[PDB]
């Protein structure tokens, strides 16, 4: 795991350095988005696992 | 106190009061409704203090005698309790604040003549007078 932004790219052309930085930034943004989505899905899974049984019990008792 | 009450259904205080299970249940229901409404009113009062102590005292006094109407056994006692309730309603209406704190700065050297409170008082008083006269005439005719 190497941060290309935190790397010595002074040995290449500015355009190539910018392209490499852009690639590294794209990889890091993809990783951040994936981690954020993994955490966000938990915001649904935990509430789904929590209140489903109580809601079913309450609705059943109210109906039958 | 009503929850622990027990006894036999009969007339009380020279047949001027009716103590029946239905009357007790009606009194209990009225008291429960009044208590819920009072809790709501207190919660609203904690938000903004737009009401004075006099309005609360009038409400408490009205609530003190409101449940007694269900125990009436004769039209004379009913008329007296209804007149008392009407007087309490008029007193509560008189307890309404006439002025309120507003950001209306343009009206500082001009007079705004609002006749809402006076109209309410006049209408309530005249209707109460007419209704009391009718109820008294009805009672007098029924007794004969």
């Amino acid at each position: 795991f190497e941060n290309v932004l935190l790397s010595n790219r002074k040995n290449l052309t500015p355009q190539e350095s910018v392209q490499k930085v852009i690639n590294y930034a794209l990889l890091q943004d993809a990783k951040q988005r994936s981690r954020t989505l993994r955490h966000i899905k938990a915001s649904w899974v935990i509430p789904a696992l929590l209140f489903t049984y109580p809601a079913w019990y309450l609705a059943k008792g109210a109906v039958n | 106190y009503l929850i622990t009450f027990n006894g036999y259904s009969s007339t009380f205080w020279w047949s001027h009061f009716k103590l029946n299970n239905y009357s007790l249940y009606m009194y209990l229901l009225v008291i429960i409704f009044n208590n819920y409404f009072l809790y709501i009113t207190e919660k609203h009062i904690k938000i903004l203090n737009n009401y004075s102590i006099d309005y609360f005292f009038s409400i408490i006094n009205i609530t003190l005698f409101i449940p007694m109407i269900f125990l009436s056994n004769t039209l004379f006692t009913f008329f007296f309790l209804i007149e008392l309730v009407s007087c309490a309603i008029f007193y509560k209406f008189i307890v309404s604040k006439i002025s309120f704190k507003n950001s209306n700065y343009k009206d500082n050297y001009f007079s705004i003549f609002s006749k809402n409170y006076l109209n309410v008082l006049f209408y309530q008083y005249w209707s109460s007078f007419f209704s009391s006269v009718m109820i008294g005439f009805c009672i007098i005719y029924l007794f004969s």
């Binding site: - | 950001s103 700065y105 343009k106 500082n108 050297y109």
Partner: protein, 53 residues
């Protein structure tokens, strides 16, 4: 200004009303001349009161 409500303090004086309000001629006349009445000046308000009467 402290204790003056929406009324603020200017440079050459202090206002008698809210910001961007209407300066009443009667209020200014009362404030300037405390009790001086050089004449019963016939203003629009006075004429309106006379017409109402």
């Amino acid at each position: 200004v402290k204790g003056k409500g929406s009324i603020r303090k200017g440079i050459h004086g202090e206002g008698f009303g809210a910001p961007s309000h209407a300066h009443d001629a009667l209020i200014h006349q009362i404030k300037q001349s405390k009790d001086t009445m050089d004449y019963q000046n016939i203003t629009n308000e006075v004429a309106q009161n006379f017409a109402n009467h």
